[PDB]
Design an enzyme around this catalytic site. Sequence first.
Site, PDB file in Angstrom:
ATOM      1  N   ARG A   1       0.867  -1.160   0.000  1.00  0.00           N
ATOM      2  CA  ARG A   1       0.000   0.000   0.000  1.00  0.00           C
ATOM      3  C   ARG A   1       0.909   1.216   0.000  1.00  0.00           C
ATOM      4  O   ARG A   1       2.126   1.125   0.245  1.00  0.00           O
ATOM      5  CB  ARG A   1      -0.857   0.052   1.287  1.00  0.00           C
ATOM      6  CG  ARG A   1      -1.946  -0.995   1.375  1.00  0.00           C
ATOM      7  CD  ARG A   1      -2.555  -1.090   2.746  1.00  0.00           C
ATOM      8  NE  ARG A   1      -3.456   0.009   3.111  1.00  0.00           N
ATOM      9  CZ  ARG A   1      -4.059   0.100   4.306  1.00  0.00           C
ATOM     10  NH1 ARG A   1      -3.826  -0.833   5.213  1.00  0.00           N
ATOM     11  NH2 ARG A   1      -4.964   1.047   4.581  1.00  0.00           N
ATOM     12  N   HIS A   2       0.307   2.337  -0.348  1.00  0.00           N
ATOM     13  CA  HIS A   2       0.933   3.648  -0.291  1.00  0.00           C
ATOM     14  C   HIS A   2       1.378   3.785   1.193  1.00  0.00           C
ATOM     15  O   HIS A   2       0.799   3.140   2.081  1.00  0.00           O
ATOM     16  CB  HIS A   2      -0.182   4.666  -0.511  1.00  0.00           C
ATOM     17  CG  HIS A   2      -1.347   4.441   0.400  1.00  0.00           C
ATOM     18  ND1 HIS A   2      -1.387   4.941   1.685  1.00  0.00           N
ATOM     19  CD2 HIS A   2      -2.433   3.641   0.281  1.00  0.00           C
ATOM     20  CE1 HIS A   2      -2.435   4.448   2.316  1.00  0.00           C
ATOM     21  NE2 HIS A   2      -3.086   3.659   1.492  1.00  0.00           N
TER      22      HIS A   2
ATOM     23  N   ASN B   1      -5.540   8.138   7.024  1.00  0.00           N
ATOM     24  CA  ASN B   1      -5.361   6.826   7.656  1.00  0.00           C
ATOM     25  C   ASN B   1      -5.239   7.114   9.158  1.00  0.00           C
ATOM     26  O   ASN B   1      -5.870   6.455   9.995  1.00  0.00           O
ATOM     27  CB  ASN B   1      -4.098   6.108   7.154  1.00  0.00           C
ATOM     28  CG  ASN B   1      -4.312   5.308   5.851  1.00  0.00           C
ATOM     29  OD1 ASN B   1      -3.356   4.964   5.170  1.00  0.00           O
ATOM     30  ND2 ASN B   1      -5.549   4.991   5.527  1.00  0.00           N
TER      31      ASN B   1
ATOM     32  N   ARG C   1      -1.447   9.545  -2.608  1.00  0.00           N
ATOM     33  CA  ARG C   1      -0.754   8.733  -1.617  1.00  0.00           C
ATOM     34  C   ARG C   1       0.122   7.653  -2.234  1.00  0.00           C
ATOM     35  O   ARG C   1       1.188   7.369  -1.728  1.00  0.00           O
ATOM     36  CB  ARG C   1      -1.730   8.146  -0.589  1.00  0.00           C
ATOM     37  CG  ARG C   1      -2.888   7.292  -1.123  1.00  0.00           C
ATOM     38  CD  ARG C   1      -3.875   7.098   0.023  1.00  0.00           C
ATOM     39  NE  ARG C   1      -5.079   6.312  -0.271  1.00  0.00           N
ATOM     40  CZ  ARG C   1      -6.187   6.784  -0.835  1.00  0.00           C
ATOM     41  NH1 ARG C   1      -6.255   8.051  -1.223  1.00  0.00           N
ATOM     42  NH2 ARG C   1      -7.280   6.029  -0.869  1.00  0.00           N
TER      43      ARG C   1
ATOM     44  N   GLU D   1      -8.304   3.466  -5.284  1.00  0.00           N
ATOM     45  CA  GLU D   1      -8.975   2.734  -4.203  1.00  0.00           C
ATOM     46  C   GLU D   1     -10.461   2.566  -4.451  1.00  0.00           C
ATOM     47  O   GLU D   1     -11.072   3.355  -5.169  1.00  0.00           O
ATOM     48  CB  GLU D   1      -8.767   3.426  -2.850  1.00  0.00           C
ATOM     49  CG  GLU D   1      -9.384   2.691  -1.627  1.00  0.00           C
ATOM     50  CD  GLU D   1      -8.818   1.277  -1.364  1.00  0.00           C
ATOM     51  OE1 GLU D   1      -8.754   0.448  -2.298  1.00  0.00           O
ATOM     52  OE2 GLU D   1      -8.459   0.977  -0.205  1.00  0.00           O
TER      53      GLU D   1
ATOM     54  N   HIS E   1      -3.669   0.262  -2.637  1.00  0.00           N
ATOM     55  CA  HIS E   1      -4.497   0.565  -1.487  1.00  0.00           C
ATOM     56  C   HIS E   1      -5.021  -0.714  -0.876  1.00  0.00           C
ATOM     57  O   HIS E   1      -4.969  -1.772  -1.501  1.00  0.00           O
ATOM     58  CB  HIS E   1      -5.692   1.408  -1.931  1.00  0.00           C
ATOM     59  CG  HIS E   1      -5.321   2.569  -2.812  1.00  0.00           C
ATOM     60  ND1 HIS E   1      -5.045   3.827  -2.310  1.00  0.00           N
ATOM     61  CD2 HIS E   1      -5.139   2.648  -4.148  1.00  0.00           C
ATOM     62  CE1 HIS E   1      -4.696   4.621  -3.302  1.00  0.00           C
ATOM     63  NE2 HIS E   1      -4.743   3.937  -4.428  1.00  0.00           N
TER      64      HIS E   1
END
EC number: 2.7.1.105
Lengths: 432, 432
Positions: free
Chosen positions: B219-220, B226, B269, B289, B354
């Site tokens: 993931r980023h 987040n 991201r 995402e 994502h």
Amino acid sequence: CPTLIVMVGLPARGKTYISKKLTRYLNFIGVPTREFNVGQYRRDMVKTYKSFEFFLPDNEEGLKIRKQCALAALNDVRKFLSEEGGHVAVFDATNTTRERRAMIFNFGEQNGYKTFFVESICVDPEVIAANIVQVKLGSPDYVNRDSDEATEDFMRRIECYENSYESLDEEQDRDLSYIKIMDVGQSYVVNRVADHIQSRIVYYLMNIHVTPRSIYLCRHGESELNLKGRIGGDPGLSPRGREFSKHLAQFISDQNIKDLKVFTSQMKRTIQTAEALSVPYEQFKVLNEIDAGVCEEMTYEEIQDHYPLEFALRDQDKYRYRYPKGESYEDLVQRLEPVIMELERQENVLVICHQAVMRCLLAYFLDKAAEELPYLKCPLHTVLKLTPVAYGCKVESIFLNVAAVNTHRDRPQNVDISRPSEEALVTVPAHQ
Amino acid sequence: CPTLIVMVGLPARGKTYISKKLTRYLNFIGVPTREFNVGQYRRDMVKTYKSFEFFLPDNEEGLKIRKQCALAALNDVRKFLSEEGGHVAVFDATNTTRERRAMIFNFGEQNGYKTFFVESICVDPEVIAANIVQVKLGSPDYVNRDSDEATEDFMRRIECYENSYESLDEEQDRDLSYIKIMDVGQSYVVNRVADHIQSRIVYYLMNIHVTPRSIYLCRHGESELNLKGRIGGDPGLSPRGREFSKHLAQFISDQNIKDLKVFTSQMKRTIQTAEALSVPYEQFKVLNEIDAGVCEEMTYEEIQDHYPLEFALRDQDKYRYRYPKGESYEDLVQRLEPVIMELERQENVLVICHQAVMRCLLAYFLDKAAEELPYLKCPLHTVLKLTPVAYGCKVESIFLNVAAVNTHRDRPQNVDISRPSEEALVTVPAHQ
Ligand SMILES: Nc1ncnc2c1ncn2[C@@H]1O[C@H](COP(=O)(O)OP(=O)(O)OP(O)(O)=S)[C@@H](O)[C@H]1O
Ligand SMILES: Nc1ncnc2c1ncn2[C@@H]1O[C@H](COP(=O)(O)OP(=O)(O)OP(O)(O)=S)[C@@H](O)[C@H]1O
Ligand SMILES: [Mg+2]
Ligand SMILES: [Mg+2]
């Protein structure tokens, strides 16, 4: 690495036809592509065609001039890919010998391109004969010449290539990337697809055909929101929409179409239109109308009131600009790629859709520019019948005799950001 | 018409391997598919394998028993397609003679299925030899037997098939739909793709390979939202997200990967995470995402507050249910089909994505059920390295040593519509 597509095959094997379909397709999906027809270069260079003797394999002078035209074509390929930002170039010529093909291969190599060969093979005389009449006798080389002498000259012309014709070999040419199309696309031989674009090219080529057929496109019958001049949403049919549905069913019956396939979106207006027919249909959300995002269900007046900025930009470039949270016609084109592919693979097909979607499909089969696509006229209660032919597609507009509101908005003369609202809405059609 | 895929080829030509990849793929895209391995039927029926003599082409009794196992397999094919609602059935056996193939063809015909043949051809000894060691010596037939006697028995076993092996012919079998894969997928021969599903099967098969490589998914780096426990949106990296980016770059360098391809979504991201590397990357919105629609940027508390109904349904079936105006994981799977295809075609590849997207990709390569897919654990700042192997895919979880918030929400025990809010949010991770 731009891509250099090299056509290969004897005269009258559908090379130019394939070259064209491939180029149009690639451009539709946004890959700058251009075809270079060596025959056209020759025609522009030689001025007038006399007879087949020019193409004799033992005609040294002819070969020389023939080589010059090829080179002229290759030079423009270089300019397009290397200087104009082209992505793919289709070099359309017979390229029937190992010699020429290696020469072209070398050209690609020295220029930094990936080479991919597309060979079209036909051993069927009735097809070849059909091709001559169908495309050759009318071509520049033979227009204004007697059919019989024209025909004889061409056959003798094909003959010039037979003794030296070296088809792509599994072993001799095993390091080359290529596809060989046989039986008019019945069978294929594919070797070393080098990348993503070549994989898509092969996927495309393996799904196109020349089986006679018609593509019928029409919008769902007029909807409740069409009456109100409201865009998008998921309205049901209006009374006239229902009337149209019954006129469509009769039309389809009267048409007596062999194995017709019917497609609709997952939106009630198209389904409800489809329910009126005898024949079954398949619904696909990929056919849903373009998304208007925040302006969904709004009227243009409302849009101008709440989104004067986005509305102006969209008018400035209706292919690229979108409403907030909505799709552009460009996004829609991308979205419709699977539809385009299945339509090519299909034979007789009827697609009951929507305004924006239909404009995208019309632009594809009618080879309309991206800039022109958002404005194509797709009137309600009218069926557009498309009959793909050599190099083009004939279209017939068939009104199904049912009144309907006009949902077509012309691009207003004033598209300036901060334009008065009256000028922005000046081209809005009557409704309510 | 369900589809009956008939595998064809000598032993150790990757038939079972292809059968498996094809079946998994078709199931991933939602087409109920099941493979029927005649060798497994035989193993369940014969109990124990002695030696190659069972497969002698002149062994009448063996042939008889071999025919019985085939039939048992075919009967389950019939039950699956005709009685259980299966869409495609892959019949995995050598099917090396015209005789057997015609028999199977007849079976398909009498049952109302479309038959498509997939022949795998390999004339390379080192590959065959590699296949034996790699998959055969460990198989049930040979486990607990000496490698050398096992190996000799198998070679003699392949021999049983050579004298009677009749490969698909361009003329003799011109009416059959089929694909012949050669050189481990270097070249292909395709004939008469009869429909849409066969076109997709061919498209799939032509893009898979066995070139050794690893797929890296991560993931980023942790994002601003987040930290807040907020879903979706387009946040930039948090301070830790940036730290991770630098740890990823070092990891990628240390990996010394041959020609690595790097992909990201069009969301900042992932891009911002990608900016940290030495290597260039390509951004694709198809990797964005999953869309949360009306609950975009909201916290689960907020979601439970405003959409208690949709939130409960989504928990009941997180694969199929969505938030209003959002995507389900099912819609996401469909959306990712092009990604799956290009990943198969790729070699060494790193995809910075994502949570939801990564779960979909993990489920594909790890063959996780749809019901399990929405819940796969994809922790932040961790790289999942996948190494596709025969029939499976090894996975290694590599933490890049950077703290991060937990975005993983377990399915709460209470998913009842009208459930108290405290029970709905009981599994929500800590944040802010
Ligand atoms: N795969 C194919 N097999 C045979 N004919 C084809 C194929 N695809 C298209 N055609 C037909 O071929 C015609 C178009 O032929 P062209 O494209 O002019 O042939 P050509 O091979 O380019 O000949 P040149 O350019 O004179 S060397 C139309 O009738 C098509 O329907
Ligand atoms: N197209 C291919 N060419 C050659 N080998 C392949 C191919 N695809 C996969 N393999 C390798 O083949 C092995 C798997 O072979 P299997 O699928 O068991 O062969 P098999 O042909 O099914 O033999 P049987 O079932 O005993 S008749 C793995 O090593 C794969 O990497
Ligand atoms: Mg040509
Ligand atoms: Mg097998």
